[PDB]
């Protein structure tokens, strides 16, 4: 039962439903872009992201000797129709690989159920969508209709390997940290991946290694989706909450350690975790109270009780006699723990049976150009480690020295730190 039930081509004609010219609510102007709806609540825009941030409109670098070590610029990437076709197919293929695991099925199901909360209304008896959780889709008659969505995958901005999960803020509300959630825009490319080293002492050393093994891009996307899950349920950790790494005031956010999981997650001390968990549980109670006071809805895309049921389902709320909603500690803790401890990069690594960095705290060695769309290169089931070939065992398919035709090294980062 595939996640993406159509095999889109980029040049397939627009139909205003799942192949459409859209605008995003950046609070400024833009020419429509061609987008593809690959699943309920999830869209793919094969364009370089010059739209989410008005000050990152330019695909050219900061000058030749202005730039960060782990970075890669190519202003022509993703400018042509063949590259957009291929980007679309590559991204689809990674959703299918993820979805083919039970962990991935769970995570993508929680993302689709994770509809951003309708807390846009200034009247506490009235439930309203926040419009930055929508896109504007041009219909066949050439007019615009607003469409709620949970996730957009878009190409990277100027720095091709700066993958991240962004979302539109609110004037007052902290949407990704108040339980509400907001639509998530992942900057991501399936056309590149990172090199790492199989020895831990090497991988965590800035001066050693050329990056012998390649990260499976399904792992990289899953990392971004895990962030997105947190942000859709409005439980992301404030990035100012950091762990001090111990020669340079190096720190790492808790939100990152959590997302990686494994040994790394244990560096977040128990008092602080209890404090976040209590905090988010309180946020959810504020949502339960807001739903209780809602008598009216705005719009007529759905009924008040349709939407209450939607949020009941999202937040796993208990419903008593009056149709009064409450939060049950047990169900809150299971959800919370699902989204923070079960969904983690490290867990994904076990599911995919791939070689991966052992810690979030490593020094990237290199960046490689890849092509995962041909089945002779990469499949849903095996990634690069193709069954019943010489690349099946020992992660040989990720080994850039053995599987050398699937990887072109574009830049070394080692030494430049």
């Amino acid at each position: 039962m595939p996640f993406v039930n159509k095999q889109f081509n980029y040049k397939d004609p627009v139909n205003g439903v799942d192949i459409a010219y859209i605008k995003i609510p950046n609070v400024g102007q833009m020419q429509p872009v061609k987008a593809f709806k690959i699943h309920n609540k999830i869209w793919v825009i094969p364009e370089r992201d010059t739209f989410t941030n008005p000050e990152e409109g330019d695909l050219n670098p900061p000058p030749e000797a202005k730039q960060v070590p782990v970075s890669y610029y190519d202003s022509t990437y993703l400018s042509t129709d063949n590259e957009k076709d291929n980007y679309l197919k590559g991204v689809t293929k990674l959703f299918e690989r993820i979805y083919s695991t039970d962990l991935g099925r769970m995570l993508l199901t929680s993302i689709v159920r994770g509809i951003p909360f309708w807390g846009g209304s200034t009247i506490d008896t009235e439930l309203k969508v926040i419009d930055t959780n929508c896109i504007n889709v041009i219909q066949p008659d050439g007019s615009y209709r607003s469409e709620e969505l949970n996730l957009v995958i878009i190409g990277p901005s100027a720095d091709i390997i700066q993958f991240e999960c962004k979302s539109f803020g609110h004037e007052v509300l902290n949407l990704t940290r108040n339980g509400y959630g907001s639509t998530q825009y992942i900057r991501f490319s399936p056309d590149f991946t990172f090199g790492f080293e199989e020895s831990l002492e090497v991988d965590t050393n800035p001066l050693l290694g050329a990056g012998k093994f390649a990260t499976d891009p399904a792992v990289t996307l899953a990392h971004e989706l895990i962030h997105a899950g947190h942000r859709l349920y409005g439980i992301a950790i404030n990035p100012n909450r950091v762990f001090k790494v111990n020669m340079s005031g190096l720190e790492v956010s808790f939100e990152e350690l959590r997302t990686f999981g494994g040994h790394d997650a244990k560096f977040i001390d128990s008092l602080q975790e209890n404090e976040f968990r209590l905090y988010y549980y309180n946020k959810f109670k504020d949502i339960a109270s807001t739903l209780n006071k809602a008598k009216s809805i705005v719009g007529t895309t759905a009924s008040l009780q349709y939407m209450k049921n939607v949020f009941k389902e999202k937040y796993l709320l208990s419903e008593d006699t009056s149709g009064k909603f409450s939060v049950d500690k047990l169900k809150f803790d299971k959800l919370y723990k699902m989204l923070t401890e079960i969904y983690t990069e490290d867990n994904f690594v076990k599911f995919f049976k791939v070689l991966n960095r052992k810690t979030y705290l490593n020094f990237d060695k290199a960046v490689f150009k890849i092509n995962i769309v041909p089945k002779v290169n990469y499949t849903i089931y095996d990634g690069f480690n193709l069954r019943n070939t010489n690349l099946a065992a020992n992660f040989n398919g990720q080994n850039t020295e053995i599987n050398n035709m699937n990887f072109t090294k574009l830049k070394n980062f080692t030494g430049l730190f």
Binding site: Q162, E164, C165, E224, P239, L361, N362
Partner: peptide, 8 residues
């Protein structure tokens, strides 16, 4: 800001 070395 993910990636550790990009957020350093």
């Amino acid at each position: 800001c993910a990636r550790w070395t990009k957020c350093l």
